């Protein structure tokens, strides 16, 4: 089988900016390539085929070349709707191979987060569980330190982090950190607290509530 | 309109058969071909077949006995048959279109793509719980102890879009998804405007609207 090796595997790079990515074809593959773009929870879509074919509709920012085995996809003027997995895919003899992927995130300014808590519902203590969520809204860049304290008493082993992927317009992450417990154990304490450290912040930010 | 629609059961025990339909629209099944490609969750991309305008079907080596393909032109269907699933096929099933009968012309449309789970556990809809809420509040659903994926969630039936953020599903220990969907809304909107997150389920026909209050 053709392998074909994309490089970089993830790249960040600010709206306005150039950025290159590239496929080495194993074997000739003649000019049979093409490249795709892939959002986040979407089928791929078709940029480029025949290694430098403009597909209809697509922006002219997006163009493809090839140096023999070497295969370029340059992103011109990238824009915040950019941000995607790419891929090379080479079909000129079976198997048809892809390149393992491009991940390009879109670099902007530190954004601190908005952080948020919520108690857990009386429909889910009525279950027998307790779900303590605190959210952070709208920050860059992904990284985070949310810790759970629970009467002052740090928490771990029992929480769980999630994040977005980033928005289409302002490029920004949004995370959520879900702490959960026993009914019993809920009870047995008052003060349950998220303190969030983020590099936008200048010192950390802790939401609370009292357990009522 | 030219489509590609991918549908069929999601979850498929260890060792028994995917069956995949594929539904094409605004062109003919004898005038172009359709590949089909499944992506594992978080890898890459993986060609599996196609089958040709007049018929001949070409096959990933190492699958090809496990993978079967027939065409009914009158309805617009490709169908994939996938034999002795294992949970490693696990994956986000898409079909492809691709002009004629030789691999030299390129694909161009892609479906939507279809999550497929192998696991012999068995199916589980949602349990839905509020999250109840400067000039900005939070409010969002748990979407809690629900398998296979995917649930979608939405706010007011399609109206509220704007701030919503749904979050990647987290597989837990017991192995039952959960997740939050949460929105920021003017703190001024808390007792006047209702908000309601819908989840739909479809792996288990599962439908719950549940309103948020402010406590
Ligand atoms: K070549
Ligand atoms: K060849
Ligand atoms: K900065
Ligand atoms: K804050
Ligand atoms: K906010
Ligand atoms: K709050
Ligand atoms: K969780
Ligand atoms: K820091
Ligand atoms: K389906
Ligand atoms: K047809």
């Known amino acids: 089988d053709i392998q074909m090796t994309q490089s970089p595997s993830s790249l960040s790079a600010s709206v306005g900016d150039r950025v290159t990515i590239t496929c080495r074809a194993s074997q000739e593959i003649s000019g049979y390539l093409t490249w795709l773009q892939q959002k986040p929870g979407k089928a791929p879509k078709l940029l480029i085929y025949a290694a430098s074919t403009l597909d209809s509709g697509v922006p002219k920012r997006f163009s493809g070349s090839r140096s023999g085995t070497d295969f370029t996809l340059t992103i011109s003027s990238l824009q915040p709707e950019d941000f995607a997995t790419y891929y090379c895919?080479?079909?000129?003899?079976?198997?048809?191979?892809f390149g393992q992927g491009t991940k390009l995130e879109i670099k902007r300014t530190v954004a601190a987060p908005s952080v948020f808590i919520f108690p857990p519902s009386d429909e889910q203590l009525k279950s027998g569980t307790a779900s303590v969520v605190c959210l952070l809204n709208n920050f860059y860049p992904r990284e985070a330190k949310v810790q759970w304290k629970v009467d002052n008493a740090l928490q771990s082993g029992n929480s769980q982090e999630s994040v977005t992927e980033q928005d289409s317009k302002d490029s920004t992450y949004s995370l959520s950190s879900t702490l959960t417990l026993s009914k019993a154990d809920y009870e047995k304490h008052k003060v349950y607290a998220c303190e969030v450290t983020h590099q936008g912040l200048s010192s950390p930010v802790t939401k609370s509530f009292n357990r009522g | 309109q030219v489509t590609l629609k991918e549908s069929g059961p999601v979850l498929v025990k260890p060792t028994e058969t995917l069956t995949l339909t594929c539904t094409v629209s605004g062109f003919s099944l004898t005038s172009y071909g359709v590949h089909w490609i499944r992506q594992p969750p978080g890898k890459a991309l993986e060609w599996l077949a196609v089958?040709?305008?007049?018929?001949?079907?070409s096959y990933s080596t190492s699958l090809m006995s496990r993978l079967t393909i027939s065409k009914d032109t009158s309805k617009s269907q490709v169908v994939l048959t996938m034999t002795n699933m294992d949970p490693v096929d696990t994956a986000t099933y898409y079909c492809?279109?691709?002009?004629?009968?030789?691999?030299?012309?390129?694909?161009?449309?892609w479906g939507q793509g279809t999550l497929v789970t192998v696991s012999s556990a068995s199916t589980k809809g949602p349990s839905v719980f509020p999250l109840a809420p400067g000039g900005t509040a939070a409010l969002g659903c748990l979407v809690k102890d629900y398998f296979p994926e995917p649930v979608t969630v939405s706010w007011n039936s399609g109206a509220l879009t704007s701030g919503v953020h749904t979050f990647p599903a987290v597989l837990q220990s017991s192995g039952l998804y959960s997740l939050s969907s949460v929105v920021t809304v003017p703190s001024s909107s808390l007792g006047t405007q209702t908000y309601i997150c819908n989840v739909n389920h479809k792996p288990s026909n599962t439908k719950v609207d549940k309103k948020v209050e402010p406590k």
């Open positions: 895919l080479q079909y000129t003899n079976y198997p048809l191979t």
């Open positions: 492809a279109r691709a002009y004629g009968d030789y691999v030299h012309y390129a694909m161009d449309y």
């Open positions: 089958i040709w305008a007049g018929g001949s079907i």
